[PDB]
Structures are given as structure tokens and as C-alpha cells.
Design a protein around this ligand. Structure first.
Ligand SMILES: [Zn+2]
Length: 353
């Protein structure tokens, strides 16, 4: 029902390309060894970072809201904390890529009620072809690897592939096979004072991070094995507090009682050799920029070579004209409830910038 973006231009040429957006779940920045966590929770992404110069790791990205649909309404559209309802009145990222001539795919391991009018169902139905892998629980994110390959074989020249993961969502223990609890019973690098149940839950979160590392690295590796022209962005919708913040008694997500560990997220960009060769771009000076996921669509637009009325290059984290803005958090529907993420305590801790 919404009109197209005006003065729409694509400067990325007309060669075939495949672009991938991997939406993780409940994965914070501070429990991944890729971001300095002393437990080896992400060995495959670490090794990829050491050996592949085209993996760009962004160190200062946070989400704006710690609830899945509430953040995805901002991340996937032009809505943000100051204007949270723009997802109703302006196009989404998927709409935008359709206007650019891409065939769009939605692969997901999240339980989607296709017969019901949920906001996630609407988003996933905005694409040309959907793969719902979790329609009924022990369903692991490796479920997406087979349809991913299938979509990679799809002959459309320009393709957008969205992969929606369960990531490290509660309950953490169910995100990974029972025989892959690498950190079960381990007390190294654990905060003090946990009881048996809290300790088990903490280690379960690190195990889920290990499996999620395997899944994201597998998506990158399979994509690379297709020798594609394109790139893949991986982000988590939001983080998750798991006894990280002193006094180490809190587990979960609470927007009215925010901690940094609920808001820090991984943010990775893998660029294929063909795309980097054809679209040379240096990101090495962008990796520490303070950025909010709420403006993702501009970054995506920048990476895809798209401009239009409403495009804001200064809010793309890879743009030479990038200008840092306040990273708002807080409920945008309450009266004057927005606060600066930087005001939260414990920002000096590892992975908690
Ligand atoms: Zn937005």
C-alpha cells in the first residue's frame, strides 16, 4: 500500500549479486570471544577473522530496544526511537530491495504463525519466497543451512536472502544439541556468587553462543563456497543479561531496568572476493564507530549502492560522511522515556563499551 521511494538510484551496476542479512537473536556482544570474552565461545568466527581480511567486525554497535518485534520494527524500516511508527507509513528494507529489482527470500528457524496476523508474519510475507523451518522444542539453527544452499542455487540474478535465527534465546539449553554442552560444570571466568541453577544457566548461555558461532560461521562458509558476488551482514536483534552486571543476580531483558549486556550486539560484515574486487571499499577505519542498530537501513542502503529521498548517508556506519548521533534506548511510546545508552554503568568492562 505504500508508494515507492522517490528519486531511487542504484549505483552498484547490473551484474548479478546475492546479498545476505542474518538476523540473530538474544546474542550480546560481551559473551563472544570475537569481542574479547576470555572463554572461547566463538572459535570459528575468531579463526575466520584471523584468516579472512574481508570479515569486518564492528565493535561499538548497540540495539535500541531489547525485545524482538519492537527492535525489528526499527532495524528493518526507517523507524527509530524518535519516530517508532514509521514502519507503518514508509517502506521496509524488503520493500526497498524489491523496488531495486531483487528477488527476496526469508529463511527462518523462529516459530511463525502463518495463519495469524503477527508483525513477524507480515515482515516475512513481504518477500517473494519463505522457508519456515520451525512450525510446531529442539529445532537447531543448522536447520537453515539446507534451504540456504537451495536459495543460493536459485537462478534469479539479484537475490536478497534473510536468515532469521533463534540464536541464543531462552531457554538457552534448547538452542544446542545435548551432547554439545562444552562449558557444562565449568567455573572459569564465571561471576561470583551464583548458585547451581544460575551457574548452569550461565554456562548454557555460553554453550548456545558456541553453537550460534558454528551456525553463523557455517552460513558465511557455505556462502563463500558458492563463490558469490555479494556480501553478508550478521547482527543480533538485541543482547541478553546473563548475570554479567554486578551484583550478578539478573538474567533476562528489561527495558525499564536496562543493562549494557541487553543492548550490545555483534555486527559483522563479510564481503566476497568478487564484490570487494568490483566495489573496492576500506572499512578498517569504521569498526569502532558508535552506532545504533535502529539506523541499519541506511548502512544497508549504503552497502547496496542505493540512494533515494530519505536516504541518510550520515547514519550509515560505513559511510565517509558518517556522523555519530545519540544512541537512544528506552521505550519510545512512553512520554520522554528515551535515554543515552552511554549513561549506563560498567561501560569499561570487556565487550561492554
Ligand atoms: Zn530504522
Amino acid at each position: 500500500a505504500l508508494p515507492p521511494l522517490a528519486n531511487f538510484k542504484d549505483e552498484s551496476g547490473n551484474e548479478p549479486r546475492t546479498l545476505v542479512l542474518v538476523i540473530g537473536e538474544s546474542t550480546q556482544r560481551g559473551r563472544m570471544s570475537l569481542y574479547g570474552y576470555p572463554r572461547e565461545t566463538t572459535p570459528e568466527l575468531d579463526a575466520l577473522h584471523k584468516t579472512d581480511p574481508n570479515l569486518t567486525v564492528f565493535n561499538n554497535v548497540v540495539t535500541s530496544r531489547p525485545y524482538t518485534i519492537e527492535i525489528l520494527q526499527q532495524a528493518l524500516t526507517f523507524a527509530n526511537e524518535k519516530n517508532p511508527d514509521l514502519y507503518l507509513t514508509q517502506p521496509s528494507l524488503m520493500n526497498m530491495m524489491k523496488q531495486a529489482g531483487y528477488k527476496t527470500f526469508w529463511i527462518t528457524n523462529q516459530q511463525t504463525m502463518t495463519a495469524r496476523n503477527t508483525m513477524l508474519t507480515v515482515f516475512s510475507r513481504q518477500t517473494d519466497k519463505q522457508y519456515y523451518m520451525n512450525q510446531q522444542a529442539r529445532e537447531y539453527d543448522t536447520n537453515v543451512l539446507k534451504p540456504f544452499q537451495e536459495v543460493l542455487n536459485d537462478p534469479a540474478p539479484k537475490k536478497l536472502i534473510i536468515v532469521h535465527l533463534l540464536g541464543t534465546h531462552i531457554k538457552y539449553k534448547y538452542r544446542y544439541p545435548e551432547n554439545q554442552g562444552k562449558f557444562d560444570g565449568n567455573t572459569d571466568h564465571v561471576p561470583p556468587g551464583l548458585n547451581a541453577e544460575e551457574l548452569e544457566s550461565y554456562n548454557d548461555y555460553d554453550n548456545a553462543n558456541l553453537y550460534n558461532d558454528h551456525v553463523v560461521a557455517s552460513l558465511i562458509k557455505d556462502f563463500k563456497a558458492a563463490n558469490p558476488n555479494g556480501f553478508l551482514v550478521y547482527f543480533s536483534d538485541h543482547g541478553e543479561e546473563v548475570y554479567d552486571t554486578p551484583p550478578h543476580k539478573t538474567q533476562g531483558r528489561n527495558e525499564d531496568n536496562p543493562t549494557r549486556h541487553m543492548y550490545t550486539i555483534p555486527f559483522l560484515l563479510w564481503t566476497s572476493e568478487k564484490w570487494q574486487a568490483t566495489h573496492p571499499r576500506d572499512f578498517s577505519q569504521d569498526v569502532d564507530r558508535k552506532y545504533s542498530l535502529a539506523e541499519l537501513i541506511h548502512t544497508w542502503s549504503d552497502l547496496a549502492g542505493l540512494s533515494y529521498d530519505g536516504y541518510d548517508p550520515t547514519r550509515s556506519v560505513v559511510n565517509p560522511q558518517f556522523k555519530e548521533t545519540t544512541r537512544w534506548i528506552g521505550n519510545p511510546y512512553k512520554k520522554n522515556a528515551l535515554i543515552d545508552y552511554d549513561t549506563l554503568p560498567y561501560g569499561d568492562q570487556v565487550g561492554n563499551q
